[PDB]
Design a binder for this molecule. Sequence first.
Ligand SMILES: CCCNC(=O)OC[C@H]1C[C@@H]2CCN1C[C@@H]2c1cc(-c2ccc(OC)cc2)nn1C
Lengths: 136, 122
Amino acid sequence: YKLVPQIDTRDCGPAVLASVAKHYGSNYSIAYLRELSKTNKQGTTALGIVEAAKKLGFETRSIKADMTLFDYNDLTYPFIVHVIKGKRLQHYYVVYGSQNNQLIIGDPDPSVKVTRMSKERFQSEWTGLAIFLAPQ
Amino acid sequence: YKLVPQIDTRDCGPAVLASVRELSKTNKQGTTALGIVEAAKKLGFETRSIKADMTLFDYNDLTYPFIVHVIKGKRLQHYYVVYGSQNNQLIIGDPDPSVKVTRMSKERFQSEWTGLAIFLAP
Ligand SMILES: CCCNC(=O)OC[C@H]1C[C@@H]2CCN1C[C@@H]2c1cc(-c2ccc(OC)cc2)nn1C
């Protein structure tokens, strides 16, 4: 699971983006994506992630789902989620898949990176917003 | 229920801040929840933000009014004002000038809400 850790506090949005591109081929510098995604001091908005994704030639959709979303096997990984971690309100993960009760996620937090996560935990952080991407 | 409707598709954050003009690190995409907070702190507010679920509305302490981050269709950084939980239905304010204040079912609200609530007091 090819994931790009962040470094500046604000980078999480650019980072999940780039993590996604790598997977589906492309490479892209985070400072660039900062400027594309209109990431500012307080991270990126959900919107910013989208516009950007579109401009890298991605077919983007976003939805409000609930946990049941993960009961459906055609779910095309990877994709992005908006989550809340403690005081980080504009955080995001990459979702790679799910062997077991558990999700394979990538937290651009360089101290976490890719990791398994329980669904209780995930539910409790996840905003319901998912952003699905595929190349055009 | 004092609510200030918005004008541009971006003002929704400033608009909910209207809580009893033009500001606060609000860029071309509405705002971040972060921005709403900082701002609220300016204006002299004590700000508590938390991830909740619907059980939150089971709380008799619940200090209305307060703010929520919700998704409306493809408006991903939208927000409402929550005025009260008078029964199985909520009193909300949608800065969307075509909606403004309105009752809302909890199934509907659950379906739009991101879980994020931001509580303010002077
Ligand atoms: C600043 C004004 C609000 N201050 C505040 O501390 O929170 C408002 C109320 C609601 C409720 C009772 C007292 N206080 C905090 C309480 C609450 C509910 C919840 C809650 C947390 C998680 C939930 O789902 C996962 C649900 C509710 N947390 N908390 C702290």
